[PDB]
Design a binder for these strands. Structure first.
Ligand SMILES: OC[C@H]1O[C@@](CO)(O[C@H]2O[C@H](CO)[C@@H](O)[C@H](O)[C@H]2O)[C@@H](O)[C@@H]1O
Ligand SMILES: OC[C@H]1O[C@@](CO)(O[C@H]2O[C@H](CO)[C@@H](O)[C@H](O)[C@H]2O)[C@@H](O)[C@@H]1O
Ligand SMILES: [Mg+2]
Length: 580
DNA sequence: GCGATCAGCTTG
DNA sequence: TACGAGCTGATCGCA
């Protein structure tokens, strides 16, 4: 049965009620400076469809959109908010976002459209977006009659589902998580994405030229050592050269042929000079393809800025993800790649980049949740946690901790946060499972509180069916009861890791909200540009640096109060590279 | 021809 | 290569 609605030619008072489900449709996946194809409003007076050119030109409608007292319920309000920002229109009063609500109730459902969220409450009177718009090269905006009914059905679904979703969130003790954390954060992310980050394209192009020369040199050296030319970027062709022509040892395979992963080549390095060259070729090749050419592809030709999109409703732990471009995986570990960051610069003259990061937030969160006396004391003394861990597991004094010992203790700490297992640690340190098991036993002997916590959280996941974070984020773990060892073990590691990674996510999200409130109170021009899991990157006038050096760390350290202190380091400079 | 999947890389 | 992510070149898919 078709859904009734008015296909209006002009905006009317009835369409501007103080509460409504609103749909501002942006079909392009990347909504930056993208078209709004249609608008639907459902309220107490009825259902309406409005053409964008008409509604967005209407003074009354624009005023309604920007009136905080006129409440709107939507799905993915950030998409609408940003598309509107590009048009110079402010969207205010969004009191409910169905996408974020669904995400909090169950991140595993992978809800990415209204139909998916609605199915959670047995509501199916709305079609999936893909069914209406198609996918890939066949994607397109349907004729008005089809488009209009779809937007109205989405608005109608949002109108009907708000109460049931809010009711379940309340039962889960997640009502504040949605209203005081995720929704306010959505507006902040919208501002960050819209602001964008300035790129020194001249610098990038120059780097690309130098890289091209180096790649050519290494490429030729590879063919010389191989005795022939081949596609180095072809794992299949490479495997033939390495394991057949050069007779290198086969220590691991894949599916179609031999394995040539970095971990494999690193071990084969001692056998032939060609290996080190292949690894170098791959390093430079990634910089060229992704961080030079790929980046330049998404830089806006007019402003020279990149506008990422932070997916706020994707990760299973509560973290954000970043795309087109992903600004959360810019090289930094190796100096040659780190130089890439010299291309990310302030957007205005005489401004600087300011970066603040939490020091060991995951292990500090673990100390707090596990209430481990030894771990808490370690952070209360602000000790080098990896050196401390080495001292404890190897039973030696600080002066007796060797570099190799610290390195292995650090690996143990990573394993503890990820969800420890002898195989995982053995694989990472290239040692036997038995040896790894001994390291783990020693760790738990020194941190009995952490041991109790890991045992208890797995038991809790089985009893309740899910685990939670500090601010009540939830993750269901049905595989925790599997009779298949591998499947169950993966779920157990998720039970151990999610409260840690997820609570750290909760904390920085709250820090972002608190920070923006302080920046506004102080009327600073400084603003957030990026978030990279445990760090915040801002840009501001050089004249604001001293104030930021005190303000940002304080706000981040005070976001929440734990049993141990939170510590934040910070740096600033002329480019992202220099904010070190 | 196209798009989906594999294998490699990058980050916290 | 453990936990959580995204991008790109090569290749198995077959319409
Ligand atoms: O707008 C972001 C929001 O949209 C979803 C779909 O509901 O993802 C779409 O947009 C992303 C950004 O362009 C794309 O990466 C993704 O492929 C596309 O489906 C949500 O996942 C996200 O929260
Ligand atoms: O030996 C107990 C020890 O094993 C773990 C897995 O490392 O859990 C196993 O034993 C539990 C019963 O004590 C089961 O509930 C669980 O399903 C099984 O994998 C640890 O959690 C536990 O400390
Ligand atoms: Mg850090």
């Amino acid at each position: 049965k078709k859904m009734a609605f008015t296909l209006a030619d002009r905006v009317t008072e009835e369409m501007l009620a103080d509460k409504a489900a609103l749909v501002v449709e942006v079909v392009e996946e990347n909504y930056h400076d993208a078209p709004i194809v249609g608008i639907a409003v459902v309220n107490e007076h009825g259902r309406f469809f409005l053409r964008p050119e008409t509604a967005l030109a209407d003074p009354q409608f624009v005023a309604w959109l920007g009136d905080e007292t006129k409440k709107k319920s939507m799905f993915d309000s950030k998409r609408a908010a940003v598309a509107l920002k590009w048009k110079g229109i402010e969207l205010c009063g969004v009191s409910f976002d169905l996408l974020l609500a669904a995400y909090l109730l169950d991140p595993a459902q992978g809800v990415d459209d209204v139909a998916a969220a609605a199915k959670m409450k047995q509501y199916e009177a709305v079609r999936p977006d893909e069914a209406v718009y198609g996918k890939g090269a066949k994607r397109a905006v349907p004729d008005e009659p089809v488009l209009a009914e779809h937007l109205v059905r989405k608005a109608a679904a949002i109108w009907e589902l708000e109460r049931p979703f809010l009711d379940e969130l309340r039962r889960n003790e997640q009502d504040r998580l949605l209203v005081e954390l995720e929704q306010p954060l959505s507006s902040i992310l919208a501002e960050m994405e819209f602001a964008g980050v300035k790129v020194d394209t001249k610098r990038l192009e120059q780097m690309g030229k130098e890289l091209a020369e180096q790649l050519g040199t290494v490429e030729q050296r590879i063919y010389e050592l191989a005795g022939q030319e081949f596609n180095i970027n072809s794992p299949k062709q490479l495997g033939v050269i390495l394991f057949e022509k050069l007779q290198l040892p086969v220590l691991k395979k894949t599916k179609t042929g031999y394995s040539t992963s970095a971990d494999v080549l690193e071990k084969l390095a001692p056998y032939h000079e060609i290996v080190e060259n292949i690894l170098h070729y791959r390093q430079l090749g990634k910089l060229q393809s992704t961080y030079i050419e790929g980046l330049l592809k998404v830089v806006r030709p007019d402003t020279k800025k990149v506008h990422t999109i932070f997916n706020q409703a994707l990760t299973q732990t509560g973290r954000l993800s970043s795309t087109e471009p992903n600004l959360q995986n810019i090289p930094i570990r190796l100096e040659e790649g780190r130089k890439i960051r010299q291309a990310f610069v302030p957007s205005e003259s005489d401004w600087l980049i300011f970066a603040a990061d939490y020091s060991q937030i995951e292990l500090r969160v673990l100390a707090h949740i596990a209430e481990d006396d030894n771990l808490m004391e370690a952070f209360r003394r602000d000790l080098d946690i990896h050196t401390k861990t080495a001292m404890d597991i190897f039973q030696v004094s600080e002066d007796e901790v060797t570099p190799n010992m610290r390195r292995q203790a650090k690996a143990v700490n990573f394993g503890i946060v990820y969800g420890i297992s002898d195989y995982g640690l053995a694989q990472n340190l290239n040692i036997s499972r038995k040896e790894a098991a001994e390291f783990i036993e020693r760790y738990f002997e020194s941190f009995p509180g952490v041991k109790r916590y890991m045992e208890n959280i797995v038991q809790e996941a089985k009893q309740k069916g899910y685990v939670t974070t500090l601010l009540h984020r939830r993750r269901y773990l049905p595989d925790i009861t599997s009779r298949n060892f591998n499947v169950r073990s993966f779920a157990e590691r998720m039970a151990m890791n999610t409260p840690i990674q997820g609570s750290a996510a909760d904390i920085i999200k709250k820090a972002m909200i608190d920070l923006n409130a302080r920046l506004k109170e102080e009327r600073l021009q400084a603003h957030l540009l990026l978030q990279v899991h445990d760090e915040l990157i801002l840009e501001a006038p050089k004249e604001e640096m001293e104030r930021l050096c005190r303000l940002v760390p304080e706000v981040m350290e005070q976001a929440v109060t734990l049993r141990v202190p939170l510590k934040v380091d910070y740096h600033y400079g002329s480019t992202w590279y220099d904010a070190k």
